[PDB]
Amino acid sequence: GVNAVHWFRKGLRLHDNPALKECIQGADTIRCVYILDPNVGINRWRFLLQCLEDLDANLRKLNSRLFVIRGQPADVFPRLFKEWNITKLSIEYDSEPFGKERDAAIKKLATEAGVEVIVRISHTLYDLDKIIELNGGQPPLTYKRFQTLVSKMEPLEMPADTITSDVIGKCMTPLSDDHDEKYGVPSLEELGFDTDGLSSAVWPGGETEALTRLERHLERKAWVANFEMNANSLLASPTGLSPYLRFGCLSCRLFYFKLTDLYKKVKPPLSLYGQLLWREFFYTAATNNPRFDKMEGNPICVQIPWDKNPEALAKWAEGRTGFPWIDAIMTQLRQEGWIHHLARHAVACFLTRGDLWISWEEGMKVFEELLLDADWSINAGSWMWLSCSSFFQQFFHCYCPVGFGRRTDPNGDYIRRYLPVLRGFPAKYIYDPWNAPEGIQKVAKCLIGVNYPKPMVNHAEASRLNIERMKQIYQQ
Ligand SMILES: N#Cc1cccc(Cl)c1NC(=O)Cn1c2ccccc2c2ccccc21
Task: Reduce the DSSP state of residue 428 to 3 states and report it.
Answer: coil
| 77: Cβ contacts below 8 Å, ≥ 6 apart | 106, 109, 110
CATH of the domain at 83: 3.40.50.620
Within-domain flag for 200: no
Within-domain flag for 26: yes
Sort 414 into a burial class: Cβ within 10 Å, 0-12 / 13-18 / 19+: buried
User: Can you tell me the distance from the alpha carbon of 422 to that of 128, in angstroms, rounded to the nearest whole number?
Assistant: 48
**Which technique was used to obtain these atomic coordinates?**
X-ray
Burial annotation 170-182 (CB, 10 A radius, 16+ → b, else e): ebebeeeeeeeee
Give Dmax (Cα) for the chain. 82
275 marked as part of a ligand binding site: yes
Residue 455 identity (one-letter amino acid): P
Within-domain flag for 202: no
H or E element in which residue 409 lies: none
Residue 8 identity (one-letter amino acid): F
Residue 191 identity (one-letter amino acid): L
Cβ–ligand 1 distance for 8 under 6 Å, the answer: no
Q: Which domain-ending residue is among 122, 141, 159?
A: 122
User: Can you tell me the distance from the alpha carbon of 42 to that of 297, in angstroms, rounded to the nearest whole number?
Assistant: 32
What 8-state DSSP symbol labels residue 125? Answer: S
Q: DSSP per residue over 34-80, as a string?
A: EEE-----HHHHHHHHHHHHHHHHHHHTTT--EEEEES-HHHHHHHH
Say yes or no: 139 and 269 in one domain.
yes
* Whether the Cβ atoms of residue 52 and residue 38 lie closer than 8 Å to each other: no
Cβ–ligand 1 distance for 423 under 6 Å, the answer: no
H or E element in which residue 13 lies: none
Within-domain flag for 334: yes
Resolution (angstroms) stands at: 2.0
User: Can you tell me the distance from the alpha carbon of 205 to that of 411, in angstroms, rounded to the nearest whole number?
Assistant: 33
Say yes or no: 152 and 21 in one domain.
no
Cβ–ligand 1 distance for 306 under 6 Å, the answer: no
CATH of the domain at 465: 1.10.579.10
Say yes or no: 98 and 148 in one domain.
no
Task: Give, using CA atoms, the residue closest to atom 4 of ligand 1.
Answer: 278
Say yes or no: 409 and 350 in one domain.
yes
Probe residue for ligand 1, chosen from 246, 330, 341 as the CB with the greatest number of ligand atoms within 8 Å? 341
Q: Which domain-ending residue is among 246, 267, 289?
A: 289
Within-domain flag for 184: no
* Whether the Cβ atoms of residue 212 and residue 204 lie closer than 8 Å to each other: no
* Whether the Cβ atoms of residue 17 and residue 92 lie closer than 8 Å to each other: yes
- Distance in Å, CA 246 to ligand 1 centroid: 13
Within-domain flag for 114: yes
Say yes or no: 212 and 243 in one domain.
yes
User: Can you tell me the distance from the alpha carbon of 22 to that of 250, in angstroms, rounded to the nearest whole number?
Assistant: 19
Per the structure, the complete domain to which residue 128 belongs is given by: 123-168+207-289
User: Can you tell me the distance from the alpha carbon of 124 to that of 465, in angstroms, rounded to the nearest whole number?
Assistant: 41
Within-domain flag for 272: yes
Q: Which residues pair with 29 in a beta bridge?
A: 3, 172
Sort 321 into a burial class: Cβ within 10 Å, 0-12 / 13-18 / 19+: buried
